[PDB]
Amino acid sequence: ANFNVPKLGVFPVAAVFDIDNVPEDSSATGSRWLPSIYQGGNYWGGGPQALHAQVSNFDSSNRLPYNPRTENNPAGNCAFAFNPFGQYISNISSAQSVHRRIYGIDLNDEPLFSPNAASITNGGNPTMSQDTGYHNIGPINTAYKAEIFRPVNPLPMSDTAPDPETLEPGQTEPLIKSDGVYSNSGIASFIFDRPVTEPNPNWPPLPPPVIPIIYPTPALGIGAAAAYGFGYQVTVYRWEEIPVEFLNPEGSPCAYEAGIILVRQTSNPMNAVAGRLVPYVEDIAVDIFLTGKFFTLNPPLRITNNYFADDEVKENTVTIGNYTTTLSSAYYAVYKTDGYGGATCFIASGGAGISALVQLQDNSVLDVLYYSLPLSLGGSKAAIDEWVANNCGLFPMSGGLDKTTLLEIPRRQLEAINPQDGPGQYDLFILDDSGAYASFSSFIGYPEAAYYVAGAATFMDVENPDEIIFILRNGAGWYACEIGDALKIADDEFDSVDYFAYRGGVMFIGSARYTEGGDPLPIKYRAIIPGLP
Amino acid sequence: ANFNVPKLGVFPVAAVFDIDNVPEDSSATGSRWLPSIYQGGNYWGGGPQALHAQVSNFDSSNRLPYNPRTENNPAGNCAFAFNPFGQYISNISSAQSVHRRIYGIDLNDEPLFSPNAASITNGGNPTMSQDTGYHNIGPINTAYKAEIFRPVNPLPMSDTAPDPETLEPGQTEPLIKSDGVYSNSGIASFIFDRPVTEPNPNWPPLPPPVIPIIYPTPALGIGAAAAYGFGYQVTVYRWEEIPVEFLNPEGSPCAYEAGIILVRQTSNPMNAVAGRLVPYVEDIAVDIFLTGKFFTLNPPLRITNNYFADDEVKENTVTIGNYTTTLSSAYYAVYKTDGYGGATCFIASGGAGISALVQLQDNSVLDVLYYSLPLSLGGSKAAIDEWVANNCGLFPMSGGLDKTTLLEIPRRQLEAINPQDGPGQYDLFILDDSGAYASFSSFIGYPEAAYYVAGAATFMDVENPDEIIFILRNGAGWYACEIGDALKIADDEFDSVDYFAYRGGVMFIGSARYTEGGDPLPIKYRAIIPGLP
Ligand SMILES: [Ca+2]
Ligand SMILES: [Ca+2]
């Protein structure tokens, strides 16, 4: 719905200052601290402060361990979702390993875990990687480690023929039944901010409710999981029968039977026993608790954060990760600034994938929380802006003022109080009596106090100097500030407003300069104070 | 030996310039691009250029893999020595493992390597670390990995009783003799820039001379080694005897003997064979080729490199490693500068240990080669200066001019052509007619062309303004440049020379300023051109 905004007047210039005590910026390069009138789409601005993000070259060594920030792990730095899972697949090979390991035949034996490929790919949001350097089963490298092998029921042992000199049946490990029934373990999903737990048998009323089994190490991207019921079958043998017989006169020994086993004490042949080793098929089941190490690639970032304060220009720079050489500028980047070195930024090196929500103060990184831009956004600036607004509460409020037949701006940017789209958020505020300005003028606005001060209302005729726009955030009305005097150079020539910012009731202007030949010169900086109510 | 240097005259000031177009530096802080007259000990200066090195906080995750730079591995970044070694110790446990692995009983079996602790400590120059995350033998983590197990002689197999239905003796693995002779392997020293090789049997005249066995991965700090002759003993059994016998009339079978084994074909009891399984003790020897992963802690570094050029002041900053927050300034640091952003630096975060030789150009790290300061230097500035000169060809030539009864300087700094100590390198050059200057004046000199221009000859009397010293590098003579006019402020007051640099026949001066109360003000910068011959 449209809403008319009447021009209530013109704010006269109360003071002008040449800003000379500052570093030289080439008009062909741009201001190092003053955002250009074409950068409204990169800011939710609050003052003469400018940021730029560079992406360092990287490789598979620039890793971000999966360390999710949650209620239970507030010190983690990941905000994106990742839910890996898999199973221990049972077959002659893996059963062999589990078997030899639980019976103590060989403690280096361990079955190989089978991750679900798609849960690792994670819909490419972001694409995760398994750290195969984490653990190895012999010559095989794996990102998984069996921590605990727990048989569900006490392990069976096979009986053996009674001892000749003791008649006491011995013992030996059951033999795996190669053609028996194999059972894959259940679903093992890794968790990172809390241990794997099982319900306390006698929970009510004895605490604790659950019992911790194993712990993940989120700082290292190590997750924990439980693979219940890995099963295979074995052949167990049990002793049997009795004894007795009657062998006499010139001897004392008898004979008969088939398939049976007769043993007679070596110290006393009269003391005897018999029986058989009956083979039974048994189910071996074991719960296996494991850990998994994951990560995603994270290109190092370098951010400059410069602003004007105390009449000077403070330059800052920060790096995140092992920065080496620059690969390019960040694909996407929006900055909310306070005008004094404070800034919340959302930086995405690419059009999708790993992104960083950064909190800055001068050259200090107060915090970094990582997000991931879904591939579905198709690298669309407009699409990402909405996604960031929804997931981080950030939106480029400084971009929005536009001049078609008249100046107009959406409620959202004008009010600059709610980053998310919503009812009435796209209502259009049209400024009346603003038709003379040209269509090609660009605006970067600063929502402060009662006004949305947008810089850069230009004219098709050189004779008319640029004007700054002050719009009441309640839509009640707007004012213009003619800064012709402040911008006047030659008798008939004027400096244009190419860089603009507004803070504490003060306007900061940057003007591009060139030689008669067209060679870049230092940007002219000025400070203009409007006579506000 | 002393050498007299006569004062040949006074170089008049040909021009003076107020350097105003530069950033504000607090007199309580120091110049950001102009070295102070007290920093001669940190430079082999070449112009108005200043550097500072900060050490980031770090932990065991900030690693420097051992990647030595040598003729065969020119892309490595380590220059310090490290020679780890160890052996595979033979005993029932390790023999068991090697045995089960070479005979294919269990392929996850691997003996544990025994490093020589002191070779790892490396005399703390620097202290090296083993990467136990590199490989594991079951639940045990280790920095070593057996790559190849090579038996010296073909593995023996034990015979077994002939097959009842075939009469053909079978086979089975020999049994380890628990109380047999165990032999530790030979010395295994890891190498990083070339493979482990063995001489080519038929070398002359058939190439190649040596044969590559395994390769190290220096970029990952992975070294390679050969552990020859790991030995243990086994009990091997061999078949024996013959057959024949004569059992008749109502039968066809005989009996006798003791400890012997008689087998009669199941399909033909008449076809028979006999013998015994004779046990012999055999020596099993195996060469084992392995890799080892090492590294040393490397605190990230951040370096500012600022200088004046094209009448402006260029500020640069570089980081090496994953810099986070600052822990402190580098303990030791010397910089050789060209005056235009180019610099070779030797930075040591601590008083001993890992150090970096860095090549810079503005904000670009051209190269980094790591060295190690021996603990024996006792963190002594003077001791390290000599060590760096000897191992890197770097010495703080800008520090050396001193005024006792007269100005004097050692040949080494004066000539500024050879960083190493040596004959005549400490000959003292004493400037005649320089006795009026005060003892507490400080000097930072710049060896350029024919002169060693040292800034800061001060007087005990405020009435006399500071003077700049020009000494002929051949010791032929010296000149002074009275810059009283250029430094004059009040009628009876003068600015002092607190920061100084000299380049292209131009003198750069920095002067500390304060309020009548004693509050710091911006440093006053000037450019003075002396009327040279
Ligand atoms: Ca337009
Ligand atoms: Ca002195």
Swiss-Prot record, chains A, B:
Coiled-coil segments on the chain, per record: none
Keywords assigned by UniProt, alphabetized: Disulfide bond, Host-virus interaction, Viral attachment to host cell, Virion, Virus entry into host cell
Annotated Pfam families: Prd1-P2
Location relative to the cell: Virion
The UniProt record lists the keyword Disulfide bond: yes
InterPro entries: P2_sf, Phage_PRD1_P2, Phage_PRD1_P2_C, Phage_PRD1_P2_N
Gene3D superfamilies per the UniProt record, alphabetical: Pseudo beta propeller, receptor-binding protein prd1-p2, domain 3
Disulfide bond is among the record's keywords: yes
GO BP field: symbiont entry into host cell; virion attachment to host cell
Source domain of life: Viruses
Any one of the GO CC terms: virion component
Purpose: Adsorption protein. In association with P31 and trimeric P5, forms the spike complexes located at the 5-fold vertices of the capsid. Involved in recognition and attachment to the receptor on the surface of the host. Likely triggers the processes of vertex disassembly, membrane tube formation, and subsequent DNA injection. Essential for viral infectivity.
Name under which the protein is recorded: Adsorption protein P2
Organism: Enterobacteria phage PRD1
Taxonomic lineage: Viruses, Varidnaviria, Bamfordvirae, Preplasmiviricota, Tectiliviricetes
Gene behind the chain: II
